[PDB]
């Protein structure tokens, strides 16, 4: 029965940092003894909890979370089995089953040299900067910075949008009964996200109960190229070029840039819908009487959000809310990075400055969350199953095919069998798998 201790869970996992800027600070541990000393004295009491972060009046000036790799845990003398072999083997090893070469990876990600990540969030970079100083002064050479990624909410009216322009963070699983569910939102057991929580089938070490597996990915987005492809391949029609291009963009994502799901508004954006959390997730893909297996006029089968949360595609209720595939939910805590598109990139339709998403997913089993979604669903041209045509193609957004163009069907409303071959517009530079421990562990077992 008994519910989540939110005083002991790190905030990013369930609520997110709530800050304009974030820094991911990837480190190695040089001397364990010293390191544990400050881990306990200086990190642990300032680590931000879910309880802390969901009180308007209790937000720290700088929000800090911390998570450790397998090689990080080992370095701290912590040889316990966390019960995740994807976690133990590391993301570099997992790269092939993603149909991606580590040739474009951050060199520091393409191994197991990284022992952890500190996440710092704040509403300005100055505060982040000074907090880094203060951490580096305290820890001294008991730690090395191996790599860093700065990120922020996008500027102006683009706030809450990702670099392609699309409102993100509409959709997350509701944890029963932490969250009171919205219309259409999936509801899952806590133990889908929190290791050792309600109905996590996997044995954990006791110190790790209340943590989560953080899957990090630095995903470069080629925004000019994406926009040009949309203009170049927009379906014919009586609509303006710009409307038809936007239509193709939305059909790839499954939502208009305003966030309005195309399933409910298949022919034009509806920003009032997009802004309304009571409506903007309230759908299953079913419609009377179109049949689920062949109708792509509301939303392609290949659309990103359909590919990553299949809803009524994997059975269950046709009226919301659909609760299929609960065990395959991830909490998403990602945030854009890099500069806005510049005038010169827009003009040449060519990227020169690296920008994209610092993609963060939480889950209790890596094998059921990020990794599953990416390989079994996104990368699988027969997914969802039992469609006609059977060849859905790949996720136009994250689908991978060894750096070759992805074939994706369903996108063009006038002919669902019509294929487009789509260059990659998202380019993984790698990341790593971390374990974000309960806060008690941090000054407890890990520092002890
Ligand atoms: C640069 C790459 C990415 C971009 C631009 C992107 C963009 C978006 C957007 C615009 C949405 C709609 C917002 C929402 O429904 O809340 C979304 C939803 C979602 N994405 Fe991504 N995404 C990226 C990578 C990923 C990856 C790698 C995965 C996991 C393998 C993932 C899984 C999800 C899930 C689970 C949803 C919610 C679907 C739902 O609950 O209906 N995405 N994404
Ligand atoms: C979430 O979407 C569902 C549909 O999947 C909405 O349920 C539907 O809502 C309409 C109202 O627009 C229901 O019909 C209307 O409500 C009364 C109910 O007594 C009905 O008698 C009238 O015919 C009226 O048109 C419709 O029956 C209902 N469908 C189902 C399957 O329940 C729901 O309203 C949406 N939630 C939100 C917050 O928008
Ligand atoms: C960029 O793409 C647009 C639309 O296809 C085209 O009009 C324009 O000429 C391209 N820019 C350059 C520099 O080629
Ligand atoms: C639909 O696309 C398929 C595959 O390209 C093609 O063979 C068929 O001729 C198309 N039908 C129409 C009406 O374009």
Token pair recorded at residue 129: 């900067």
Q: Which of 349, 351, 352 to mutate to test the pocket of ligand 3 (most atoms within 8 A of CB)?
A: 349
Q: How far apart are CA 283 and CA 154, in angstroms?
A: 28
From the CA of 312, the nearest ligand is 1
Phi, psi for residue 187 in degrees, rounded to 5: -130, 130
Q: Rounded to the nearest 10 degrees, what angle do helices 223-233 and 241-253 cross at? A: 120
- Find out whether the beta carbon of 280 lies less than 6 Å from any atom of ligand 1: no
Q: How far apart are CA 214 and CA 368, in angstroms?
A: 13
Q: Whose alpha carbon is nearest atom 14 of ligand 3?
A: 348
Catalytically active residues, by annotation: 168
Please list the residues that pair with 290 across neighbouring strands.
Answer: 287
Using alpha carbons only, what angle is made at residue 192 by residues 53 and 175, rounded to the nearest 5 degrees?
A: 50
Nearest to 447 by CA among 34, 36, 33: 36
Q: How far apart are CA 183 and CA 171, in angstroms?
A: 11
Token pair recorded at residue 138: 């305290």
Q: How far is CA 34 from the centre of its chain?
A: 34
Resolution (A): 2.1
Pairing of strands 419-422, 406-409: antiparallel
Distance 413 CA to ligand 2 centre (A): 27
Q: How far is CA 229 from CA 223, 246, 259, 357, 390, in A?
A: 10, 11, 21, 20, 25
Nearest to 53 by CA among 18, 9, 85, 8: 18
- The minimum-distance atom of ligand 2 relative to the CA of 320 is 5
Q: Which residue has the tokens 């299949």?
A: 310
Token pair recorded at residue 439: 């806060």
Write the Ramachandran bin of 213: left for phi over 0, alpha for psi from -120 to 50, otherwise beta: beta
Q: Could you state, in order of their start, the residue ranges of all structural domains in the chain?
A: 1-448
3-state secondary structure the chain: CCCCCCCCCEHHHHCCCCCCEEEEEEEEECCHHHHHHHHHHHHHHHECEHHHHCCHHHCCCCEEEEEECHHHHHHCCCCCCCCCHHHHHCCCHHHCCCCCCHHHCCCCCCCCCCCEEEEEEECCHHHHHHHHHHHHHHHHHHEEEEEEEEEECCCHHHCCECCCCCECCCCCCEEECCCCCCCCCCEEEHHHCCECCCCCCCCCCHHHCCEEEEEEEEEEECHHHHHHHHHHHCCCCCCCHHHHHHHHHHHHHCECCCCCECCCCCCCCCHHHHCCCCCCCCCCCCECCECCCCCCCCCCCCCHHHHHCCHHHHCCCCCCCCCCCHHHCCEECCEEECCCCCHHHHHHCCCCCCCEEEEEEEECCCCCCHHHHHHHHHCCCCCCCCCCCCCCECCCCCCCCCCCCEEEECCCCCCCCCEEEECCCEEEEEEEEEEECCHHHHHCCCCC
Q: How far is CA 5 from the centre of its chain?
A: 24
- Find out whether the beta carbon of 253 lies less than 6 Å from any atom of ligand 1: yes
Q: Whose alpha carbon is nearest atom 32 of ligand 2?
A: 319
Q: How far apart are CA 378 and CA 394, in angstroms?
A: 6
Q: How far apart are CA 71 and CA 75, in angstroms?
A: 6
Using alpha carbons only, what angle is made at residue 271 by residues 277 and 288, rounded to the nearest 5 degrees?
A: 70
Nearest to 374 by CA among 320, 428, 323, 414: 428
Q: Which of 391, 407, 415 to mutate to test the pocket of ligand 4 (most atoms within 8 A of CB)?
A: 415
Nearest to 303 by CA among 422, 221, 191: 422
Whether a cis peptide bond, with omega within 30° of 0, leads into 321 is yes
- Find out whether the beta carbon of 398 lies less than 6 Å from any atom of ligand 1: yes
Q: How far is CA 202 from the centre of its chain?
A: 23
């Amino acid at each position: 029965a008994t519910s989540l201790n939110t005083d002991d869970i790190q905030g990013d996992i369930l609520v997110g940092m709530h800050k304009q800027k974030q820094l991911f600070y990837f480190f190695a541990i040089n001397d364990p003894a010293t390191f544990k000393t400050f881990l306990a004295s200086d990190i642990a009491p300032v680590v931000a909890s879910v309880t802390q972060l969901s009180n308007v009046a209790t937000q720290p000036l700088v929000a800090l979370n911390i998570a450790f790799s397998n090689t990080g845990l080992l370095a701290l003398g912590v040889t316990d089995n966390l019960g995740d072999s994807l976690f133990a083997n590391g993301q570099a090893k997992d790269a092939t089953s993603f149909k991606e070469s580590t040739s474009s990876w951050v060199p520091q990600f393409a191994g197991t040299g990284i022992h952890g990540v500190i996440i710092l969030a704040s509403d300005t970079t100055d505060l982040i900067d000074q907090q880094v100083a203060s951490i580096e002064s305290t820890f001294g050479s008991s730690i090395s910075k191996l790599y860093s990624l700065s990120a922020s909410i996008r500027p102006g009216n683009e706030a809450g949008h990702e670099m392609f322009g699309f409102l993100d963070g509409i959709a997350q699983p509701a944890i029963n009964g932490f969250n009171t569910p919205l219309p259409g939102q999936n509801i899952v057991d806590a133990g889908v996200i929190i290791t050792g929580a309600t109905n996590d089938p996997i044995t954990r070490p006791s110190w790790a109960v209340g943590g989560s597996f953080l899957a990090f990915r630095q995903l470069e987005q080629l925004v000019p190229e994406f926009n040009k492809y949309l203009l170049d391949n927009a379906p014919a029609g009586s609509g303006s070029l710009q409307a038809r291009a936007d239509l193709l963009g939305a059909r790839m994502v499954g939502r208009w840039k305003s966030g309005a799901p195309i399933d409910l508004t298949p022919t034009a954006d509806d920003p009032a819908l997009g802004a309304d959390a009571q409506r903007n997730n309230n759908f299953t893909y079913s419609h009377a009487g179109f049949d689920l297996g062949s109708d792509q006029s509301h939303c392609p089968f290949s659309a990103h959000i359909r590919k990553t949360r299949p809803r009524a595609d994997l059975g269950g209720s046709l009226t919301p809310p659909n609760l299929s595939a609960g065990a395959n939910s991830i909490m998403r805590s990602g945030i854009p990075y890099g500069p806005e598109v510049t005038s010169a990139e827009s003009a040449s339709n060519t990227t020169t400055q690296e920008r994209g998403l610092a993609f963060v997913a939480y889950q209790a089993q890596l094998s059921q969350g990020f990794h599953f979604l990416q390989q079994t669903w996104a990368d699988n041209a027969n997914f969802p199953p039992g469609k006609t045509p059977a060849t859905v193609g790949l996720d136009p957004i994250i689908g991978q095919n060894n750096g070759q163009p992805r074939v994706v069907n369903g996108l063009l409303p006038s002919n669902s069998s019509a294929s487009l071959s789509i260059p990659q517009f998202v380019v993984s530079h790698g990341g790593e798998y971390f374990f974000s421990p309960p806060i008690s562990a941090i000054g407890g077992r890990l520092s002890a």
